[PDB]
Amino acid sequence: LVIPEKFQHILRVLNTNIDGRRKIAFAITAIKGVGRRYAHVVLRKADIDLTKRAGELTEDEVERVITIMQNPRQYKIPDWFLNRQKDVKDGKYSQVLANGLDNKLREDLERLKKIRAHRGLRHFWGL
Amino acid sequence: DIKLFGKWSTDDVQINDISLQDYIAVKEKYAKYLPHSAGRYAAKRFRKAQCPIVERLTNSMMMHGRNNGKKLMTVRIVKHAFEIIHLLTGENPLQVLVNAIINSGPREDSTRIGRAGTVRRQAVDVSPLRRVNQAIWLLCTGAREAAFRNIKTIAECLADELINAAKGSSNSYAIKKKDELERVAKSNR
Amino acid sequence: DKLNNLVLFDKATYDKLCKEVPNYKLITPAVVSERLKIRGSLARAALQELLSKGLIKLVSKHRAQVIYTRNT
Amino acid sequence: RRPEHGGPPELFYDETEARKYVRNSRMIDIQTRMAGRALELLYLPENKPCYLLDIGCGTGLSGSYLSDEGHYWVGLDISPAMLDEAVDREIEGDLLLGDMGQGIPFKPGTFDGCISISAVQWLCNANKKSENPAKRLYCFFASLFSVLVRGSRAVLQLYPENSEQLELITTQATKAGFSGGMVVDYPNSAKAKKFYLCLFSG
Amino acid sequence: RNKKHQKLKHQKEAEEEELEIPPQYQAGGPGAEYKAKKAKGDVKKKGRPDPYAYIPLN
Amino acid sequence: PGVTVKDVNQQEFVRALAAFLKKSGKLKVPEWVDTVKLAKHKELAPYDENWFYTRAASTARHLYLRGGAGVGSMTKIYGGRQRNGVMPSHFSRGSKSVARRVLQALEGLKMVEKDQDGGRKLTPQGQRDLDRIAGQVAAANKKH
Amino acid sequence: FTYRGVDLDQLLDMSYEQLMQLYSARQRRRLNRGLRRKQHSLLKRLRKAKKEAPPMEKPEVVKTHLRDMIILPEMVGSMVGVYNGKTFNQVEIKPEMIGHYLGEFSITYKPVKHSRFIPLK
Amino acid sequence: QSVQVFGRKKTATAVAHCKRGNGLIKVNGRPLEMIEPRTLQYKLLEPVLLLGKERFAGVDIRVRVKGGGHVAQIYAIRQSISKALVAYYQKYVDEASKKEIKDILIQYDRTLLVADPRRCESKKF
Amino acid sequence: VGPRLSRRILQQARQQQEELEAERERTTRLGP
RNA sequence: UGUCCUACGCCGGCAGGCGCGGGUAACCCGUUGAACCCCAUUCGUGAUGGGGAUCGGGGAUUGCAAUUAUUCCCC
Numbered sequence A: 001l002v003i004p005e006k007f008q009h010i011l012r013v014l015n016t017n018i019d020g021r022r023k024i025a026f027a028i029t030a031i032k033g034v035g036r037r038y039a040h041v042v043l044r045k046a047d048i049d050l051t052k053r054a055g056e057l058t059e060d061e062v063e064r065v066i067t068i069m070q071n072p073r074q075y076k077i078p079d080w081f082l083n084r085q086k087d088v089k090d091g092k093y094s095q096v097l098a099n100g101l102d103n104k105l106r107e108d109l110e111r112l113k114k115i116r117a118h119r120g121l122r123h124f125w126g127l
Numbered sequence B: 001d002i003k004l005f006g007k008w009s010t011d012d013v014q015i016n017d018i019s020l021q022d023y024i025a026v027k028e029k030y031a032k033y034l035p036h037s038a039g040r041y042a043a044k045r046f047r048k049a050q051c052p053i054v055e056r057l058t059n060s061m062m063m064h065g066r067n068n069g070k071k072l073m074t075v076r077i078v079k080h081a082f083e084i085i086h087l088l089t090g091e092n093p094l095q096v097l098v099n100a101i102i103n104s105g106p107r108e109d110s111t112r113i114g115r116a117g118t119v120r121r122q123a124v125d126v127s128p129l130r131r132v133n134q135a136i137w138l139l140c141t142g143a144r145e146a147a148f149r150n151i152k153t154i155a156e157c158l159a160d161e162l163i164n165a166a167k168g169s170s171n172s173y174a175i176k177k178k179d180e181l182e183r184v185a186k187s188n189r
Numbered sequence C: 001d002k003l004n005n006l007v008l009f010d011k012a013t014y015d016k017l018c019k020e021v022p023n024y025k026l027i028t029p030a031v032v033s034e035r036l037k038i039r040g041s042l043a044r045a046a047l048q049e050l051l052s053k054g055l056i057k058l059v060s061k062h063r064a065q066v067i068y069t070r071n072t
Numbered sequence D: 001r002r003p004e005h006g007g008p009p010e011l012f013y014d015e016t017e018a019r020k021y022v023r024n025s026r027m028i029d030i031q032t033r034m035a036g037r038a039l040e041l042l043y044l045p046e047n048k049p050c051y052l053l054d055i056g057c058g059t060g061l062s063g064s065y066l067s068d069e070g071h072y073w074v075g076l077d078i079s080p081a082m083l084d085e086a087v088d089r090e091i092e093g094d095l096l097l098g099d100m101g102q103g104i105p106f107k108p109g110t111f112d113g114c115i116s117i118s119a120v121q122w123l124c125n126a127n128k129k130s131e132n133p134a135k136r137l138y139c140f141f142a143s144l145f146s147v148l149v150r151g152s153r154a155v156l157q158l159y160p161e162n163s164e165q166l167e168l169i170t171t172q173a174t175k176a177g178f179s180g181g182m183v184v185d186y187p188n189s190a191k192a193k194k195f196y197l198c199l200f201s202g
Numbered sequence E: 001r002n003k004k005h006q007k008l009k010h011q012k013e014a015e016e017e018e019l020e021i022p023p024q025y026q027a028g029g030p031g032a033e034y035k036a037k038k039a040k041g042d043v044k045k046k047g048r049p050d051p052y053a054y055i056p057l058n
Numbered sequence F: 001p002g003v004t005v006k007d008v009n010q011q012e013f014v015r016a017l018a019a020f021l022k023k024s025g026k027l028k029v030p031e032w033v034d035t036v037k038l039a040k041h042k043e044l045a046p047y048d049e050n051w052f053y054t055r056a057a058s059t060a061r062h063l064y065l066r067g068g069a070g071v072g073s074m075t076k077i078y079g080g081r082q083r084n085g086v087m088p089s090h091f092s093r094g095s096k097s098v099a100r101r102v103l104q105a106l107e108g109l110k111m112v113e114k115d116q117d118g119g120r121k122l123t124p125q126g127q128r129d130l131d132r133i134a135g136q137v138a139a140a141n142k143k144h
Numbered sequence G: 001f002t003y004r005g006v007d008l009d010q011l012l013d014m015s016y017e018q019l020m021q022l023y024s025a026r027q028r029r030r031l032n033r034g035l036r037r038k039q040h041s042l043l044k045r046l047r048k049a050k051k052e053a054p055p056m057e058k059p060e061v062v063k064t065h066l067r068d069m070i071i072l073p074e075m076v077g078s079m080v081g082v083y084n085g086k087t088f089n090q091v092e093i094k095p096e097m098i099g100h101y102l103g104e105f106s107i108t109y110k111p112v113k114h115s116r117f118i119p120l121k
Numbered sequence H: 001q002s003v004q005v006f007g008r009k010k011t012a013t014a015v016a017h018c019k020r021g022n023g024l025i026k027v028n029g030r031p032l033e034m035i036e037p038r039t040l041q042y043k044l045l046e047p048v049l050l051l052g053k054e055r056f057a058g059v060d061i062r063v064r065v066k067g068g069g070h071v072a073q074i075y076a077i078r079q080s081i082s083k084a085l086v087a088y089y090q091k092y093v094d095e096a097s098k099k100e101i102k103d104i105l106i107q108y109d110r111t112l113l114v115a116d117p118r119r120c121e122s123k124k125f
Numbered sequence I: 001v002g003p004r005l006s007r008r009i010l011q012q013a014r015q016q017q018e019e020l021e022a023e024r025e026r027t028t029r030l031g032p
Numbered sequence J: 001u002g003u004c005c006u007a008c009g010c011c012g013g014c015a016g017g018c019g020c021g022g023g024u025a026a027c028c029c030g031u032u033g034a035a036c037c038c039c040a041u042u043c044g045u046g047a048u049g050g051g052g053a054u055c056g057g058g059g060a061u062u063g064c065a066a067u068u069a070u071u072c073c074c075c
């Protein structure tokens, strides 16, 4: 059809720019920490048509998608589907997306450095 | 009546070049339903001149690696290209292909010769069989290099190349290659 | 340079396609895509949309190539 | 097999070939690398902005290298399309659409150095009937010898297809007044077989 | 078989240069130490710089 | 005189049979019908969210054509080509759980029954139901 | 400090059989296959070395070749020097060293730490 | 009265049984407008489109096909069908009719009654 | 034809003839 | 080719576990239901749904032993 009057070309989701001129199942994939498969399941759990474009979602569907994103386990998303299943410091099934992934990688490498294992010393000798 | 693809008549097809009449085989003995025959057409010299020319084009679309052996893909491409040609110009695509081959064949080429350090070009004439061969090869190369990275299907670019080569316009890749080959051969008499 | 084909129809583009597409003597998603600056999915969907109104004649359909023509 | 065997250099390097040339990542890397060795092999006055002549500039790849080093230059090319895309790359040095074999049109003793990257192997093949390989090479070398400030070296990177090619080039250079030799950097190495005819004019 | 090909290709290069030389005198006026025995290639040395080949022109 | 399944276009047969099984509504759809890839060589989930109906229809058709097949035969049948990274591709079977669940759901429909010589096969209810829907498809296609 | 939401004290109280439920899959497989005589011997040796240690500073050095030893929660605070093929390297046993083998903390290899002709005539 | 012939390509072998009938033509229990590749569909109907449906109006043929690939199976199907028709009009119908049939089958496509003697080459040590 | 192809063809023809010719509890008690 | 090849049933989403059978073999895997290919859907010239490397976490399997990732699965 034609353009609606409320088409948003760029979305601001989890401090990430989302190109609205894309399919929703791949515009969500454009967020770090979300791939194609996880975006597909989070949009199917929200009961949202995948033929429908991302840039003209209303605010309610965007907020419901986000609430499923930071809360997967509350919406029957399986335990084995997540990024960090058994976190080493506090074991809980979680899904870090925007800044949590970069941070948690940083203290992962920092924990590897601080114990002077082979992997941390090798990776920080690599640069 | 035998018609290609259940639609395409071969009775009104005529060849306007007397050189290529015995080497373009589209007539009542060579009229076939499909460009797929799987015949032993290269086991003896000059045998491939009796091949239907649509089958020669189909065999020459199976190029560049990934497309080797995919003949059903190429007969699909040929069928869609023939439909696009008919729905564009309103005239039978067999005559369009025959005219494109006739206007696409180089009539005069060059040969690299040398004795020691002195490498030159000698102008020679081109046999009708090699005329047909380079015409088919340049048409396939023109279509393939034409699309390759755009929204245009291989069938649409192939149809456009046969249409513009039958017209003899300079926009075709095959016509430009024939023109530069004949220009070099004319400058190397 | 970089193509900037549109993803949903603007008003002027929709009007000019609805008054220009059913007479091209060649209707195919690629050609309407390249002459209307439309991404191929939107051009495709517009083509079965125009077929739904009976303004467009299908002559063959394939998974790789579907081709149309004018009515008369 | 070889770009040179295709035919006339201008007809070979058309708009299509020019587009593919700048799109080729290897072209960019190998040409800048060869121009680096070229500027090093020719012993240009150290810490001195030089005035070189690009005998085969093409896309201005070797030319852009000289611009970065601060050495002003003048380009020469038979391909119009390649010179168009070279000026689209906005190179600092001037350009000139001319033939090497015909002759370089500059005052005897003007250029302190000359950069030629993959362009002299095209002069050993007569693409036309009037074209004479020996004469074309000799005339070019004689013009270069004069144009080059007597003493300055003219590095000439070439890609020989046989010994006859190299033989012709060397004889037509030594008899034109060009002295020096040829530095084949990494001779055993095949991917690094780089033949540079170092030719000083004095 | 390709080894003999390459080797005497280089030999024909050398012979054609050595036969260029006498008419060059009349009408007018290479990696040997860098060869590796164990392998085909080009090995660096410490006393001499990176591999090269100088064939002077007369 | 009755038109047989083998006399009907197979893809339209599968589409109409999936529509019929969705219309009946007696299929036991598992909870994880949304969150599963159909085999390890897949990359994304199927876009057709009613994939269980189509897979059950295809399974019923296959057991009509060649009975005595078990779970492993179904994993062989819907197996495909796994692209192994920068390694050469290979052949990988389908997921066993999806085959077992479609077989048990079709068995719970009384559509499919076990046999003494092996796995599953058709019921006479299954045979005459497929014949009836094949007659419907042949009427909708051949008579038009 | 906490490990999988579990602190060190009840980690020391935590039983051997369900200690595997917080460890990783390789870890759980190894503990299912059981520690052999050498590992139990070094366990006894570490416990003995922690026994007569004076209660203000760390115990003495225990040297071993057991690179496939896993750090167990009871070892936290031991002074272990493990072999790398040539020499022994001494390491602390920190609480966050729990999931890693001993052989990771003595690297067996050293890192790799690796003029143009111009013609004058 | 009935006959049984075979046709073949590289490794695809088809066996055709020919009996009196009304014009029902079957391969593996399926019609010839149902055998999997439609792109080579006219390769299946070539004896039908040349010889006419009136000459097929009084015959039933059933073909069992095994081996090869899709294209080779189609070629075996058409070879077996043409050989079955030739055999029927040789054994139980007059000789001259078989003569014009066998003729027109030859000058259209010579492989319709003789197998192609091409197969994959072996590799030696 | 050759051995393997003819063997497959013979088996196909035999099976086809059998399935054209084609178109209970075993007798545990011997007496009628 | 096979006394490690495997049919079948159950559990798990997947690697994979449990049980019960056949095969020392044109008998069982196996009417070797292979991949390209064919049909239909989505994608639209964009280093992008092309391309997959290198990395973080978790599960499983073979072994006395997997750490410098044996291998496999998922994100």
Ligand SMILES: Nc1ncnc2c1ncn2[C@@H]1O[C@H](CSCC[C@H](N)C(=O)O)[C@@H](O)[C@H]1O
Residues within 6 Å of the ligand: D009, D010, D013, D031, D055, D056, D057, D058, D059, D060, D061, D062, D063, D076, D077, D078, D079, D082, D098, D099, D100, D101, D117, D118, D119, D122, D123
């Ligand atoms: N006779 C001749 N006169 C002028 N230019 C010539 C020539 N023969 C060949 N050339 C030039 O040789 C070039 C080959 S490519 C040279 C460009 C160089 N490799 C770089 O990118 O830095 C072409 O651009 C062509 O124009």
